[PDB]
Amino acid sequence: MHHHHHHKDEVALLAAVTLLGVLLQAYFSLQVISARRAFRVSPPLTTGPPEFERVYRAQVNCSEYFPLFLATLWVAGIFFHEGAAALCGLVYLFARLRYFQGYARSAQLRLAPLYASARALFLLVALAALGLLAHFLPAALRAALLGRLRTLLPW
Amino acid sequence: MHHHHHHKDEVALLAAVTLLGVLLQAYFSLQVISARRAFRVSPPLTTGPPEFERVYRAQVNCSEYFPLFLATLWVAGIFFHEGAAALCGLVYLFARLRYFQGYARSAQLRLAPLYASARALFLLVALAALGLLAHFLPAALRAALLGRLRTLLPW
Amino acid sequence: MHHHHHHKDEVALLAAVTLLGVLLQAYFSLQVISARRAFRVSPPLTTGPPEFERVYRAQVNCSEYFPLFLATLWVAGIFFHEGAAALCGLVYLFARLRYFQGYARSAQLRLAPLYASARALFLLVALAALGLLAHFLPAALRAALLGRLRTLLPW
Ligand SMILES: CCCCCCSC[C@H](NC(=O)CC[C@H]([NH3+])C(=O)O)C(=O)NCC(=O)O
Ligand SMILES: CCCCCCSC[C@H](NC(=O)CC[C@H]([NH3+])C(=O)O)C(=O)NCC(=O)O
Ligand SMILES: CCCCCCSC[C@H](NC(=O)CC[C@H]([NH3+])C(=O)O)C(=O)NCC(=O)O
Ligand SMILES: CCCCCC/C=C/CCCCCCCC(=O)O
Ligand SMILES: CCCCCC/C=C/CCCCCCCC(=O)O
Ligand SMILES: CCCCCC/C=C/CCCCCCCC(=O)O
Ligand code: NI
Ligand code: NI
Ligand code: NI
Ligand code: NI
Ligand code: NI
Ligand code: NI
Ligand code: NI
Numbered sequence: 001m002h003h004h005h006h007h008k009d010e011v012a013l014l015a016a017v018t019l020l021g022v023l024l025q026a027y028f029s030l031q032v033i034s035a036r037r038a039f040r041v042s043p044p045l046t047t048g049p050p051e052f053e054r055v056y057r058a059q060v061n062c063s064e065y066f067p068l069f070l071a072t073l074w075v076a077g078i079f080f081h082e083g084a085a086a087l088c089g090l091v092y093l094f095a096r097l098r099y100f101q102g103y104a105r106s107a108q109l110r111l112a113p114l115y116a117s118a119r120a121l122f123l124l125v126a127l128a129a130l131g132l133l134a135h136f137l138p139a140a141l142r143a144a145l146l147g148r149l150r151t152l153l154p155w
Numbered sequence: 156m157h158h159h160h161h162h163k164d165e166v167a168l169l170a171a172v173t174l175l176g177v178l179l180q181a182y183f184s185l186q187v188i189s190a191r192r193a194f195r196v197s198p199p200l201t202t203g204p205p206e207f208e209r210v211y212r213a214q215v216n217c218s219e220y221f222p223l224f225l226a227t228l229w230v231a232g233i234f235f236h237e238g239a240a241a242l243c244g245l246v247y248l249f250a251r252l253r254y255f256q257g258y259a260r261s262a263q264l265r266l267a268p269l270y271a272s273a274r275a276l277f278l279l280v281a282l283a284a285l286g287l288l289a290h291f292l293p294a295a296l297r298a299a300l301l302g303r304l305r306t307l308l309p310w
Numbered sequence: 311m312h313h314h315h316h317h318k319d320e321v322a323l324l325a326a327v328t329l330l331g332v333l334l335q336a337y338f339s340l341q342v343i344s345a346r347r348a349f350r351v352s353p354p355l356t357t358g359p360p361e362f363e364r365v366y367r368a369q370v371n372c373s374e375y376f377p378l379f380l381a382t383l384w385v386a387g388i389f390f391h392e393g394a395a396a397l398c399g400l401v402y403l404f405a406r407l408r409y410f411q412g413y414a415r416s417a418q419l420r421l422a423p424l425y426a427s428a429r430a431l432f433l434l435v436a437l438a439a440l441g442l443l444a445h446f447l448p449a450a451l452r453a454a455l456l457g458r459l460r461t462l463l464p465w
Contacts, residue, residue, distance in 0.1 A: 001164040009311040015230045019283050022223050043262050044212040057354040067222045067377045068332050075325045107353050156319040170385045174438050177378050198417050199367040222377045
């Protein structure tokens, strides 16, 4: 409720990539509505020509991975480095744009941008994990050390 | 680990709408379990009478958009205005309640609450984007200006 | 942009459980790719032997609930108690590991870990709600009281 300082400046790159990510998903959503119109595939029903089913499955897959991306983007960028995480985030979303576009053309044209997208996601997870190790490990090691020394009143 | 100040008060409306959103999704989930019972549609399998397939597809669609909603709600409410974002959030979730209820009755009875829900989501994205522009633009413009003036030792 | 204090230490358990959650989902994703290979079920297409359809449906269900889990984990852990929320989070994810593994074997072998997972999710929602009540209620009650007393210049 104020507060005479804010933490916006530490997370704005993350928020910018996050917004970009949302805009990407809405774009994917518009394409599926477009494919539904082109091939007359009506709500409910998610089956039809393989083409339609590739665009629909493309959107579904991106949606499933979007929270995973968001989660690791925020943990990595808060526990490791904002800029690095934001950069991997960019690569991830661009790869995902390629994945969608390719899959719409062909199943096989989804594979390479999928591999790009997973490497970038893997990098975020690695950064996040390292960032959390740096946070918990020193206190843990010290507590272990502060337990075995005792010894005590000897040694 | 304390810290003698917290930022809860800046985000509590956002957290309240977020919790409301979760409760809505669980409600949707309970209805699908109810529709599965009524029409004997057993796990796995997501096909059956169109009615069941409308309630099931209703839940699926809300689930796909829920992270997008959450993301933009938090960016908008942190970079633009908490109260405004929380309000749009309310409208979004109410529209989504209508969408679900309507779609359960009819495909065509999902359309108007869908249009309401997308306008509200659009407003959050707009707020988020404006909020981020306000944050990055001034520093960017100044840096551009601080580059071309030089001139320098003339002018 | 610094800032000579950080709030990492208040949320690191939450971030740790969140990362664990992401790793779990990626694990689920790898199993579905494995089941696709075993039973030759090719992208797009999400139908096949019931076995494959149980592993696929297992992943889908976890994905749908993962943002709900994340949302309530963060609200609960910020508005109620970090450690408690992180603990419920652990139980939730372990239950979810069991759910996946069971469902892969049998539909009926998914039920008990599902009940565990929903109780844990229910606990997080309860904590979150209590935490938010504690935050809004006192200010609300006082404002109500500060309205009816007036009376004023009497009583
Ligand atoms: C760094 C961690 C990486 C995370 C796991 C990598 S596995 C790839 C991932 N596999 C899945 O999502 C499995 C389920 C998917 N929903 C499906 O039906 O095939 C995928 O892209 N599936 C769809 C596709 O292959 O296009
Ligand atoms: C402000 C940004 C708005 C975001 C994009 C708007 S498009 C509407 C949106 N379209 C989709 O989600 C496409 C995929 C959807 N899963 C489907 O199978 O039809 C929708 O509501 N689909 C289901 C439906 O029409 O009921
Ligand atoms: C504390 C709040 C709890 C939230 C609601 C509990 S209902 C259980 C939940 N039901 C659903 O998700 C409904 C939709 C689901 N996608 C489906 O097709 O069956 C579930 O686990 N469905 C799949 C399954 O039964 O395995
Ligand atoms: C995972 C999806 C998006 C996550 C966004 C949540 C990040 C919030 C952290 C920073 C905000 C701290 C308090 C608010 C400060 C302010 O109002 O300026
Ligand atoms: C996107 C889904 C929900 C996002 C929630 C994340 C928001 C967290 C920002 C504020 C918390 C700052 C540190 C904790 C302060 C405290 O413990 O009181
Ligand atoms: C819901 C998915 C994950 C949510 C993660 C968002 C939580 C952020 C809150 C704490 C961060 C506050 C500002 C950053 C401080 C820092 O850089 O050390
Ligand atoms: Ni003040
Ligand atoms: Ni202050
Ligand atoms: Ni102190
Ligand atoms: Ni302090
Ligand atoms: Ni300084
Ligand atoms: Ni400071
Ligand atoms: Ni602070």
